[PDB]
Write an enzyme that holds these catalytic residues in place. Structure first.
Site, PDB file in Angstrom:
ATOM      1  N   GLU A 185      -4.655   1.817  -1.301  1.00 12.85           N
ATOM      2  CA  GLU A 185      -5.144   0.776  -0.920  1.00 12.85           C
ATOM      3  C   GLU A 185      -5.901   0.025  -2.389  1.00 12.85           C
ATOM      4  OE1 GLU A 185      -4.877  -1.120   1.512  1.00 12.85           O
ATOM      5  OE2 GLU A 185      -4.086   0.320   2.988  1.00 12.85           O
ATOM      6  N   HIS A 187       0.951  -1.256  -0.194  1.00  8.64           N
ATOM      7  CA  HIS A 187      -0.210   0.025  -0.037  1.00  8.64           C
ATOM      8  C   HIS A 187       0.957   1.353  -0.004  1.00  8.64           C
ATOM      9  CE1 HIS A 187      -0.846   0.706   4.569  1.00  8.64           C
ATOM     10  NE2 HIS A 187       0.604   0.595   4.332  1.00  8.64           N
ATOM     11  N   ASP A 188       1.986   1.111   0.353  1.00  6.06           N
ATOM     12  CA  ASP A 188       3.169   2.296   0.404  1.00  6.06           C
ATOM     13  C   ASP A 188       3.761   2.451  -1.045  1.00  6.06           C
ATOM     14  OD1 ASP A 188       2.939   2.827   3.464  1.00  6.06           O
ATOM     15  OD2 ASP A 188       4.398   1.014   3.717  1.00  6.06           O
ATOM     16  N   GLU A 224      -3.067  -7.240   4.422  1.00  6.48           N
ATOM     17  CA  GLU A 224      -3.786  -5.875   4.096  1.00  6.48           C
ATOM     18  C   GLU A 224      -5.222  -5.663   4.642  1.00  6.48           C
ATOM     19  OE1 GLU A 224      -0.181  -4.015   2.121  1.00  6.48           O
ATOM     20  OE2 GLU A 224      -2.221  -3.174   3.001  1.00  6.48           O
TER      21      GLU A 224
END
Lengths: 342, 342
Positions: A308, A248-249, A276
């Site tokens: 996301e 997600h980064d 996640e």
């Protein structure tokens, strides 16, 4: 009509700030310290408050912040008004066990530096390559944190207390931790995450992998063996690999390159576990729906480039490196455990 | 169940800051500038933002924001996402007639200089005589606003719009004006109120009454005589007086003198008209509750001397001044005309 939406839309900012002030003042706890399903006055709660002592009006001002959280269903009301803890107001009493509560997460999501960043959200849209936080503070987030201890604490304290409740959740549903030789935790931070796993599955050999500047300070854990390196250059050799909140980064090109480096240093008949919050395609006033969106916004405020993702999109990413049978496991309210098998 | 309570309490900050960026990006007018029950998409909305012509990813981010709004029902959703105005989304679209929306008011309730003040709500409970605004900024509200145009204007534009919609209601419901020759607006500032009243009821000689420095700039309107002075000293003689959003800026002993002075310049069968949002005697997730709580918070933040009040409290005030009849007149979602009959 307008005098409707003046309340509906005008409450939106008012509640969180009232909540925040309550958290800051302990309230949710001091209430629980009285009993099980108890029901208390403003004058009482303020009496169990040290630096209120010198303020008479302490009573009435507190009653004004509380009645808002009342009307919000965040607290519960009886009649002098009497407030008592609620289902989604208990997550704000720190457990006697450790000290855990949602408090630390929430005080971070609504920190002046997070909001001052939100106050510039309208920039991701107008200007290409704008970082709201950068626009708001005029420093790269990691520069700021290096010179801003209070900001650093709040972020770490938060993504920790969080990670815990996230792990208690996986140590309830997921069984896949029985019958593992070793997990290699990628971007594993300072090992806590896996420390947790090693201690509830001594069956496992612990490898924390992260950058050298991280690893150098990581505490020492039984089962956890640390290893420095650049997961974008080369992930270490292993059978089972963790990726809790790493993809997600990062974008798509880069997410692949990491997921590739994992395929390589993983045997055939072996998986990379990916912990996640999966974004539904049917977004609604579901906690399924909101657990993805909160980070997306945080990710837009603090990391223009992260995002996301929907189970469809993980499966596209975790396949263009060379996997198959991506077996997603629902855990709670959106916490999936997307298994990527070799 | 924590991972549930991480969205219910988590979303509470994101929604507001999203709505802001939305209003700021001018999203509700553009979705309307498409059609009646139009369902439009980021890609198109973006191309309508002339500022986002040169930021490729423009659309992508707008989508990411508008999603969060759809989930909370500010916007409406369908399948790519297509959003469209709604009952609420609508109250943020400037009218054909006047250019009026809740926008200007909601952009002020949530402006930075107000939130900053909210981030010290706790000071009101702790430090005695503390004023969150002052804690947060150094200046008093007016010191700050005299050297800070942008804030000053935001506050006017919001108080402006609010009044317009607040009256439209009064006039749709209150029979009392038809049946009046004199109306004295006590604390009328530049007398924009007593104009609107005289314009709709021209058999009324209006008197606008406030302090010299205020009155010193008020423009001229047909049917309105301005009068400089200090309402807490003497109030001009008059058949009837109006007090719109005045009582609530002051505490009991000081409301009583203002209403006394009023009762001293009234004939018998004269009446003070009190226009306030009234605090219900039992609060809930109802517009009658928040329409009183939002201001009672903004007060604590910006002026903690002020409070909202219950019909019984307004009545006690009046009786203290030596009026002899209180006729509460519900207008809409908590808005009232309270008549003090001499």
């Amino acid at each position: 009509c307008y005098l409707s939406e003046t309340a509906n839309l005008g409450k939106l900012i008012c509640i969180p700030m009232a909540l925040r002030a309550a958290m800051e003042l302990n309230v949710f706890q001091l209430i629980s310290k009285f009993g099980t399903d108890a029901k208390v006055s403003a004058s009482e709660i303020a009496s169990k408050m040290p630096n209120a002592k010198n303020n008479p009006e302490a009573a009435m001002y507190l009653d004004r912040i509380l009645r808002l959280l009342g009307a919000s269903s965040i607290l519960s009301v009886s009649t002098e008004k009497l407030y008592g803890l609620t289902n989604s107001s208990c997550c704000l009493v720190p457990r006697q066990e450790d000290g855990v509560s949602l408090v630390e997460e929430l005080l971070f999501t609504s920190d002046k530096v997070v909001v001052d960043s939100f106050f510039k959200l309208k920039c991701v849209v107008e200007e290409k390559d704008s970082v709201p936080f950068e626009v708001a503070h005029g420093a790269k987030i990691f520069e700021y944190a290096a010179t801003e201890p209070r900001m650093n604490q709040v972020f770490n304290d938060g993504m920790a207390v969080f990670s815990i409740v996230v792990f208690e959740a996986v140590f309830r549903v997921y069984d896949g931790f029985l019958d593992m030789k070793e997990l290699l935790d990628v971007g594993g931070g300072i090992g806590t995450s896996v420390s947790k796993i090693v201690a509830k599955y001594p069956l496992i050999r612990g490898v924390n992998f992260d950058l050298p500047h991280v690893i150098s300070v990581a505490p020492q854990y039984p089962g956890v063996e640390h290893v420095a390196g650049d997961m974008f250059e080369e992930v270490p050799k292993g059978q089972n690999m963790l990726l809790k909140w790493v993809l997600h980064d990062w974008g798509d090109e880069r997410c692949v390159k990491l997921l590739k480096n994992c395929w390589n240093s993983l045997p055939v008949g072996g998986k990379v576990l990916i912990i996640e919050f999966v974004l539904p395609n049917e977004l609604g006033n579901n906690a399924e729906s909101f657990n993805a969106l909160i980070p997306d916004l945080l990710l837009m405020a603090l990391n223009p480039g992260g995002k996301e993702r929907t189970i469809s999109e993980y499966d596209d990413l975790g396949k263009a490196a060379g996997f198959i049978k991506t077996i997603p496991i629902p855990i709670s309210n959106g916490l999936h455990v997307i298994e990527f098998h070799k």
